[PDB]
Amino acid sequence: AAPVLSITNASVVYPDGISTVTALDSANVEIFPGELVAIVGESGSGKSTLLSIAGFLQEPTSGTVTLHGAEGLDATSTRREHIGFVFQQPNLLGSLTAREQLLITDHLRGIKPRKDRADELLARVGLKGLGGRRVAQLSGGQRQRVNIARALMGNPQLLLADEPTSALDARLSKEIVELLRDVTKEFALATLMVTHDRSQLAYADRFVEMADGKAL
């Protein structure tokens, strides 16, 4: 009955070239365990900026972000132990195999890589047996599926998806959202999902719409 993430009155100001630009403007968002929260809006409204704040990829220029259970930890240490990332591009490391793309997170976390866990999670994403495939043997959907699984390898409490259906057709993109929500429910994850395909709102528990860095 406790929130995982709380973004209170946050704003971001990047030096856009010679001038400055307010990317995010007084964002207020709170996610609970088992919620799928979408963030809708046109391209450039501040969706990604809010996501990057939720992942401690940049401190807000004003306002506070609290991930409970990670109080007293620097920004980098917060990402490693509590947050799974589903980047817009699969961001698979070229020289590693499907299973190795889960294991390297175990390694950077300082634990003996778990092959069986990796195989179960790859199977949980419908890639059972494909642990040995390299990136060249993975389709667009398959890489995105390996990406989700990696976010799940460290068993985080915050799952951040950045338009993970942007290069997939209607069929494949539906599957990823169904998968994302199904995993969100099964493992009591708190998930932010940025999306521009409003056809996927039906699978979110709720959603925020954003314009000019202000949420509604």
């Binding site: 990604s48 996501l51 990057s52 992942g55 990829l57 940049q58 980098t76 240490s77 917060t78 990402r79 490693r80 132990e81 947050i83 990332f85 980047f87 817009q88 961001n91 490391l93 070229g94 020289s95 590693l96 190795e100 294991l103 390297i104 997170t105 390694h107 950077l108 976390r109 990696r150 950045d162």
Partner: protein
């Protein structure tokens, strides 16, 4: 270190070129190192074997001492107590069957020779074993030494002075062969000198006695400078390649950074990859180096030990690690937002 090692597996091509460059440079340095120590022993092995503490020279016009121009008068020998005259000359040796030029060192009769050389100074000339075989001469046969007939007292091993083997003769014979009234060319002191030197005398250490040899300093110096540039070139090649190379990995490093990889982890990965590559290159270079050197040591003077192959090898590898940290410094500044692009 996880990603770094498997980057090496999956792209062995790119690394083969750079490791080969490091391997060639280390091979050249190892072979140049062996050659400079070999030439140094070609010039100094005899004097070094005799292991004197100080060495007294004689000069003219207050110039720097030269083994080619120093003479010790008989009075000079009685002045320095606890000291023996060493005569050093190079001249032609001629037998009935062959001939050559060789170095002649003369010491007072009965002085024990170093175990490197063994035997003791006998009346007549003691020939190096290789030299006696070349001339078809046996112990007891007459030979022409510097225009004088001398009896071969026996065979000995080879030590060198100015790229020539040393023929050992008694102080009397050296005077006849070098046509001088002096008792020697320098004075060897094994104990610490307890006398203050004269206007024309000069005390020198064993090292400085090598610098009094004409070819030695002027050729070992040029060879040493060549080695210094080579070590420097290796470091710069690695730094140049590794700066450009680590820039190639920024994207994969950013993904790991976004995932939560610490700065230490990324720095260890990058440096680990360089260390493996540099290790490969240096091992192959020193391996091939020692082999070619051992294969050539018979034709060219080449000193081949463990320290002369692995000393420079470890030096180059450690230079690479220092260079690599310089080149990898920018792995901790990579903004993780590069992955969201």
């Amino acid at each position: 270190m996880f990603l770094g090692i498997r980057d090496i597996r999956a792209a062995a091509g790119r690394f083969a070129l750079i490791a080969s460059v490091v391997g060639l440079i280390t091979l050249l340095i190892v072979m140049l190192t062996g050659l400079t120590q070999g030439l140094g022993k070609q010039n100094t092995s005899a004097i070094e074997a005799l292991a004197p503490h100080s060495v007294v020279f004689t000069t003219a016009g207050g110039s720097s001492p030269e083994f080619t121009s120093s003479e010790i008068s008989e009075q000079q020998a009685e002045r320095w107590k606890d000291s023996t005259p060493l005569g050093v000359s190079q001249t032609r040796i001629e037998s009935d069957q062959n001939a050559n030029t060789t170095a002649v060192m003369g010491l007072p009769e009965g002085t024990p020779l170093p175990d490197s050389v063994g035997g003791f100074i006998e009346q007549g000339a003691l020939l190096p074993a290789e030299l006696a075989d070349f001339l078809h001469v046996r112990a007891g046969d007459h030979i022409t030494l510097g225009g004088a007939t001398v009896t071969v007292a026996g065979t000995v091993k080879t030590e060198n002075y100015s790229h020539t083997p040393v023929v050992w003769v008694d102080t009397a014979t050296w005077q006849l062969v070098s046509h001088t009234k002096a008792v020697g060319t320098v004075l060897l002191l094994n104990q610490e000198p307890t006398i203050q030197p004269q206007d024309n005398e000069v005390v020198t250490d064993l090292k400085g006695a090598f610098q009094a040899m004409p070819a030695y300093k002027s050729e070992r110096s040029s060879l040493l400078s060549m080695q210094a540039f080579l070590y420097i070139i290796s470091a710069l090649v690695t730094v140049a390649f590794l700066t450009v190379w680590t820039l190639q990995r920024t994207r994969d490093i950013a993904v790991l950074a976004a995932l939560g990889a610490s700065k230490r982890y990324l720095l260890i990965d990058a440096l680990g990859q360089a260390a493996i590559i540099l290790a490969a290159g240096v091992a192959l270079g020193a391996g091939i180096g020692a082999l070619l050197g051992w294969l050539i040591a018979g034709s060219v003077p080449f000193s081949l030990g463990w320290v002369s192959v692995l000393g420079p090898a470890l030096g180059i590898w450690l230079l690479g690690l220092i260079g690599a940290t310089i080149a990898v410094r920018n792995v901790t500044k990579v903004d993780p937002q590069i992955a969201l692009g």
